[PDB]
Write an enzyme that holds these catalytic residues in place. Sequence first.
Site, mmCIF file in Angstrom:
data_model
loop_
_atom_site.group_PDB
_atom_site.id
_atom_site.type_symbol
_atom_site.label_atom_id
_atom_site.label_comp_id
_atom_site.label_asym_id
_atom_site.label_seq_id
_atom_site.Cartn_x
_atom_site.Cartn_y
_atom_site.Cartn_z
ATOM 1 N N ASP A 17 23.507 2.428 18.494
ATOM 2 C CA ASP A 17 21.783 3.126 17.982
ATOM 3 C C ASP A 17 21.100 1.985 17.623
ATOM 4 O O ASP A 17 21.500 2.135 16.276
ATOM 5 C CB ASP A 17 21.981 4.280 16.783
ATOM 6 N N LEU A 18 20.693 1.464 17.967
ATOM 7 C CA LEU A 18 19.702 0.228 17.249
ATOM 8 C C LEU A 18 18.070 1.091 17.020
ATOM 9 O O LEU A 18 18.005 1.907 17.386
ATOM 10 C CB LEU A 18 19.492 -0.503 18.856
ATOM 11 N N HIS B 207 -2.686 -9.572 6.045
ATOM 12 C CA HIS B 207 -2.668 -8.693 6.272
ATOM 13 C C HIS B 207 -1.936 -8.248 6.565
ATOM 14 O O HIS B 207 -1.114 -9.425 8.119
ATOM 15 C CB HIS B 207 -3.768 -8.001 7.606
ATOM 16 N N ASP C 135 12.327 3.123 16.709
ATOM 17 C CA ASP C 135 13.091 4.154 16.777
ATOM 18 C C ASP C 135 13.946 3.887 18.279
ATOM 19 O O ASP C 135 13.405 5.489 18.582
ATOM 20 C CB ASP C 135 14.197 4.765 15.926
ATOM 21 N N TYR D 201 -10.307 -0.432 1.685
ATOM 22 C CA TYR D 201 -10.182 -0.649 3.109
ATOM 23 C C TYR D 201 -9.883 0.460 4.052
ATOM 24 O O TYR D 201 -10.303 1.395 3.392
ATOM 25 C CB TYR D 201 -8.577 -1.680 3.351
ATOM 26 N N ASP E 42 1.019 -1.312 0.249
ATOM 27 C CA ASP E 42 0.099 0.181 0.080
ATOM 28 C C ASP E 42 0.801 1.315 0.550
ATOM 29 O O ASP E 42 0.077 2.318 -0.085
ATOM 30 C CB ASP E 42 -0.834 0.118 1.603
HETATM 31 CA CA LIG Z 1 18.023 3.999 18.917
HETATM 32 CU CU LIG Z 2 -9.347 -8.323 5.843
#
Ligand SMILES: [Ca+2]
Ligand SMILES: [Cu+2]
EC number: 1.4.3.21
Lengths: 701, 705
Positions: B616-617, B465, B472, B414, B329
Amino acid sequence: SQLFADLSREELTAVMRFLTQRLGPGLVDAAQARPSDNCVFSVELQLPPKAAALAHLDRGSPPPAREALAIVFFGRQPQPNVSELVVGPLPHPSYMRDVTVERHGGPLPYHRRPVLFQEYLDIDQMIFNRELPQASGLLHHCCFYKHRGRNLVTMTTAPRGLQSGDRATWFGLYYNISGAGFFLHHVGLELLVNHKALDPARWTIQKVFYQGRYYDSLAQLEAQFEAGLVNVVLIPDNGTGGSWSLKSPVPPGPAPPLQFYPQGPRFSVQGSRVASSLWTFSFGLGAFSGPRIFDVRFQGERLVYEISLQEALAIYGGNSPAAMTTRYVDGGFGMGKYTTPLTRGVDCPYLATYVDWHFLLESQAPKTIRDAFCVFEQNQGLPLRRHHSDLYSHYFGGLAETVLVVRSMSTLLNYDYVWDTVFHPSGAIEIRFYATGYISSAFLFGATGKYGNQVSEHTLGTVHTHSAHFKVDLDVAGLENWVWAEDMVFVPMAVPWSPEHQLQRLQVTRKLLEMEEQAAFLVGSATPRYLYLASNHSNKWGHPRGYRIQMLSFAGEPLPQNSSMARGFSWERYQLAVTQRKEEEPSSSSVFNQNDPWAPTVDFSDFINNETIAGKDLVAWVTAGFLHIPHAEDIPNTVTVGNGVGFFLRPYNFFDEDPSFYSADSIYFRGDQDAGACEVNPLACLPAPDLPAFSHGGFSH
Amino acid sequence: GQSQLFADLSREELTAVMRFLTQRLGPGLVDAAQARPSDNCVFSVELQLPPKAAALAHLDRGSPPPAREALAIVFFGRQPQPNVSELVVGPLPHPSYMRDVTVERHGGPLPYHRRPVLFQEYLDIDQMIFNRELPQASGLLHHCCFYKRNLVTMTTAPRGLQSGDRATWFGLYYNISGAGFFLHHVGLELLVNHKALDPARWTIQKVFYQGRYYDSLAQLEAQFEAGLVNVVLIPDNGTGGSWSLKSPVPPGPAPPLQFYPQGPRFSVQGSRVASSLWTFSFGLGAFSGPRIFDVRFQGERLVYEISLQEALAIYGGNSPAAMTTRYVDGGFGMGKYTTPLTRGVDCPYLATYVDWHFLLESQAPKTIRDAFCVFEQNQGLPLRRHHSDLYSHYFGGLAETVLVVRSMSTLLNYDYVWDTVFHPSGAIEIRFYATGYISSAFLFGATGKYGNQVSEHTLGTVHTHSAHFKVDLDVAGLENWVWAEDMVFVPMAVPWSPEHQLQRLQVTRKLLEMEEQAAFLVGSATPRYLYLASNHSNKWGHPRGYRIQMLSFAGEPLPQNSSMARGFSWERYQLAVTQRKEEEPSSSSVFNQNDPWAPTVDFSDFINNETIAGKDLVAWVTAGFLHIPHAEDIPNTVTVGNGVGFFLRPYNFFDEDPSFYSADSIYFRGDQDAGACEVNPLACLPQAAACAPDLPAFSHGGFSH
Ligand SMILES: [Ca+2]
Ligand SMILES: [Cu+2]
Ligand SMILES: *[C@@H]1O[C@H](CO)[C@@H](O[C@@H]2O[C@H](CO)[C@@H](O[C@H]3O[C@H](CO)[C@@H](O)[C@H](O)[C@@H]3O)[C@H](O)[C@H]2NC(C)=O)[C@H](O)[C@H]1NC(C)=O
Ligand SMILES: *[C@@H]1O[C@H](CO)[C@@H](O[C@@H]2O[C@H](CO)[C@@H](O[C@H]3O[C@H](CO)[C@@H](O)[C@H](O)[C@@H]3O)[C@H](O)[C@H]2NC(C)=O)[C@H](O)[C@H]1NC(C)=O
Ligand SMILES: *[C@@H]1O[C@H](CO)[C@@H](O[C@@H]2O[C@H](CO)[C@@H](O)[C@H](O)[C@H]2NC(C)=O)[C@H](O)[C@H]1NC(C)=O
Ligand SMILES: *[C@@H]1O[C@H](CO)[C@@H](O[C@@H]2O[C@H](CO)[C@@H](O)[C@H](O)[C@H]2NC(C)=O)[C@H](O)[C@H]1NC(C)=O
Ligand SMILES: *[C@@H]1O[C@H](CO)[C@@H](O)[C@H](O)[C@H]1NC(C)=O
Ligand SMILES: *[C@@H]1O[C@H](CO)[C@@H](O)[C@H](O)[C@H]1NC(C)=O
Ligand SMILES: *[C@@H]1O[C@H](CO)[C@@H](O)[C@H](O)[C@H]1NC(C)=O
Ligand SMILES: *[C@@H]1O[C@H](CO)[C@@H](O)[C@H](O)[C@H]1NC(C)=O
Ligand SMILES: [Ca+2]
Ligand SMILES: [Ca+2]
Ligand SMILES: [Ca+2]
Ligand SMILES: [Cu+2]
């Protein structure tokens, strides 16, 4: 109300009068009973037989006799037993049947009886007057001990010993904190009290624990200490913060949002039946098993005969004997017995309807828990459905979700369990369970990494799992139901048109499950994505009228099967099970399992036994739970966020279209209309509130 | 550091960028609203998010804020080698430079067939369909479906079978009036090849009528005339709510209403929200959808960014459209298709509503009125409570009130509902509901393997779906590790009774050190406690943590053997943790949709044998479920049980539950009067809340043409 209504104070009193006559004066008030007395332990509704009951609700037949079930403690005798006696009919009881051996195959061994409150007082007396002063040396230097002041308090643990027949309970010692939870203030001492004798004088201390070490007696410990072999550290007994208090140090500010009913309540509560324009059902509490709902009809059609809590379970780990051997099977204390008042505006919306509950347990007269239930409509501030069209045709239609809720809370010592029954206008039912209150702490000593987190100065928050068992007696469009497992598969195929190319063809898969074992699903195994009970009847489109069971659980690993006590709650091993509904299989647990899980009074796995579930009256059993490694944010209490578990019952081709299409509260308008026009849109007619004065249900002594 | 670095562009700003571009793109720039494939046009203009380092320097250390820039997507059709280019323009508000970043990001030009299909393209396709094609079968159509229009077309998933294809299957539906055409598929589906830069070269590759394939529309007409086609007669009209959305039942007494007895307890200013516990900024990416930035709890940042990344629908069916639909989408754009919130239905009546501005396939900014709502919601459930009857008599508790930001994307049928929920305990909750109309096929043949019949002639096709979210977390700063805790039972002798055995319950702690150790496929098992943490400790010596708790019922992901699966690689992971990187800003692309076989972004690349210890993950969460449609999905799918998402829960981040210090908690001892105002604020409620506000008059944000 009526058929499923818990007994009234009136009825309770009547059953007790009748019991005081037909039993041999010399019957003691259970609130003072010693182990060797006779004793009415409990009296409560005895639920009607299903066949009689439906006959009366669906086909005019008259109501089955209204009876009580009484649990009696027969200790004034050569062979003491616990007996279950049915008493009836009500309101004016004339008979009294002993169903004990009909149900169990023999007497109920007396050690299975719950510990009475008087039995606790006696254990305390032993501990505080005869046992603790022998260590008033140590206890002065660790825990500010005195005379018998006392500053200390005890809390029970799990099953009581290591094999069938034992009645030895480990207790911890705790500062008797005032106005806040003592549970966080384990003072370091644990006592293994053996209270199996019927003469509380023969009661002994089998073991003692203090700082990682074991002793056969307190005197032994006190001696080791006088010998300078036990490093003592004075544990503070006052403090500040959430660790020591529940009251907030911050002035109250502007009020939280409030919901009211602009044109009055849209449901009513009569006795213990609830009716709204969409739903009717009755509700109540088992003394031992807690919350239950009966005879749930959506728009007059019955979906479920019964939904009820069966059991609640907590399995601990720890550094210390009390904690490391704790497995609470909470129906042994009783989710209804230990239900507590709801604080209006905190436990439920301020404008909920609050209902009382009456009970007769460990006393000789009815008592009442004020404000034990609440029922309310709640605007969820989320839409049930909506579509906004900008494409080809301009319209909007949707409906904001308002939900109908029944709730009560059981406070089992430190924990406050919240039980929610939630009725959706889509015709879905949502059953939820949340755990708040205090954690059980241990005294922080030694190497605690594998057993929990330090969560305060001297406080180990011990690892444990929570779980709960639900009975779901769906009667999908009648009694004869099947179970379907639907799910999905990809199947590689050539593209019809361009056969040189492939494509993963997505397909639904369906399987009828015909034998109990096929629909018993273990924790840890995967389960079909769609799982429902169906009728052979179809909806307008030719699909089996179904109700689908969708589970919300983060199950912890169940107590492994090799445990000698595991069969005291074998339902813990299943997520979902579906059996034939039997009159002789009313619960998956019993008030008696707690004090002897090694020889279980009911063993759930018995119910799964190679019978057919194809066109039978089926009941479905749901387990939901989670692992809990306490952390700093559980102080003072664990919060409810993210910790709700349970399940949804959702219509699946039961109806011919979504019932909410017919909703009185739905909203619709076309681009070409005047959305601000009252006649087009009732949102445009909108539109002291009138608040009842605040009352609280008080406390128990 | 006081600037709204994360605000979506304003109209002025959008206009400004458009003016700048107009000058510099040159001759024969066309308004994309009427652009042909061979034209040059500006497809979109929206905010370019600042780079983190600079953003944080501004916000924490008080440095000057990074330049405010836009990113514009320009379709360059008027040339030998058409390309789509990505251009940065700034600095706002008075732009003075533009740079093409296409090659920097993608390593080469963007092949032109990746571009989304323009609204004009849809319009042209329809013209070829209804003026040069359908008439070749006026006979059949006159017979079968009331022809003489009365039909509408609707597009599908990827468009073709290899990289480079632009062939779309279009289903045909009764243009229904005031309710969803989606349920009224008349059985015809055309495979339009619209790859050609000249729309006059566009052809119909294939036909599909009620179960049968035909080589052309002429050949179908032929056979129908030759009496050789058994035509199923599908009604034009009906009444049932597979026909109406309007309830035929008169309004009853009013549903419950929520209000703030003593004024509101948060404020919205621009795109910033603030209450006494939370501050954060929110917005929509035109393609990626909802995002919130810079979330501070009581002054401490927890998350730099949480944002929707992609949404995915994978269909089955036995008709060729549904059989091959995989909607990605973002290719339509969750921001782009956002719709006004109906006051009182989509959010509570007294929510605060907020407009959104965009410049998409246009040359002037437009506004979706009421695209967002922000409100406090009383949950009707306590956050915490304890009633003590034991030893000491007291009650202590707090009703949960939660702070919500919501927007809704209506992609065709939707309606996606996106919730960001802020809990007073320090927890953040992310939710995604799908509601609106299901997509359907003409019911025909062996449907049990592909869905349920759901209306007359209407098959509710099975589909999955999925949504991908970027989380972050900056737990107590940039440098984070990930921990997996869980439980185990160890069989041993009861220390004080060796005759007996007990199952010793223990905690399990593993530090996850490389990206692969923290990537978790769908259907594999996941640590019951997964959290990102600092090496900083809370007061009690435990690493300060935020844990990720997923609420998903995921379907089987599209099998990897599929040539197109690389276009949504994230679908196969439940959860992955990765080193944050300026060059890895998103796990998807507006361009993946029309060429999933040559993906513009391949999420799986982010997972590549790098340490995640002390970096920094950033976490990436996938959530979704299987949908086998059914009677109760008609008229719409309902939202009950459909919520999917995840919580971020504090785990030894604090020293104790922050809610202990709440201004709304309630406490009283047995020995006090719980009915007295000085003990209990609740007692005051009656008398200072017999004052409900006048409601503002209803208004609606309108529809769009
Ligand atoms: Ca982070
Ligand atoms: Cu559905
Ligand atoms: C558990 O304890 C119960 C009583 O302590 C016992 O029920 C009692 O059983 C006795 C005889 O077994 C009955 O006493 C009767 O004895 C004379 C005979 O001389 C009878 O004719 C009379 O009916 C007389 O009352 C009691 O009626 C009965 N008490 C009650 C309330 O039922 C159970 O049998 C014990 N349970 C088992 C399984 O051992
Ligand atoms: C992708 O499409 C763009 C084509 O529209 C193209 O940008 C344009 O590229 C040319 C040169 O690369 C620039 O025009 C130049 O024409 C004279 C020749 O006499 C040059 O000497 C000048 O530098 C002059 O500017 C365009 O200005 C440039 N347009 C922009 C906005 O960048 C891209 O280079 C194409 N890139 C890919 C990767 O193929
Ligand atoms: C599809 O049917 C709808 C009917 O709702 C048509 O919408 C109307 O179109 C007329 C012009 O012909 C407009 O003046 C109206 O404002 C429209 N009404 C609404 C509620 O949107 C539409 O023309 C038809 N479109 C196609 C492609 O068939
Ligand atoms: C534990 O400490 C509590 C103090 O909070 C004691 O409970 C009180 O008992 C006194 C009399 O001894 C009463 O007058 C108070 O009103 C009680 N407090 C309330 C609010 O509950 C109690 O003495 C101690 N109990 C034990 C078992 O040691
Ligand atoms: C379903 O089963 C019972 C018989 O056991 C029957 O009375 C009922 O009408 C049946 N309906 C069907 C198969 O349509
Ligand atoms: C299960 O049920 C069938 C009877 O219908 C029986 O013949 C079969 O042996 C049973 N299996 C077991 C293991 O008891
Ligand atoms: C966190 O770890 C890094 C090690 O790479 C170290 O430099 C830093 O000092 C550590 N801080 C603490 C509090 O452990
Ligand atoms: C992955 O990581 C280590 C380097 O620290 C290395 O030994 C290993 O071979 C690597 N494999 C790769 C990148 O292919
Ligand atoms: Ca049943
Ligand atoms: Ca059975
Ligand atoms: Ca990486
Ligand atoms: Cu817990």
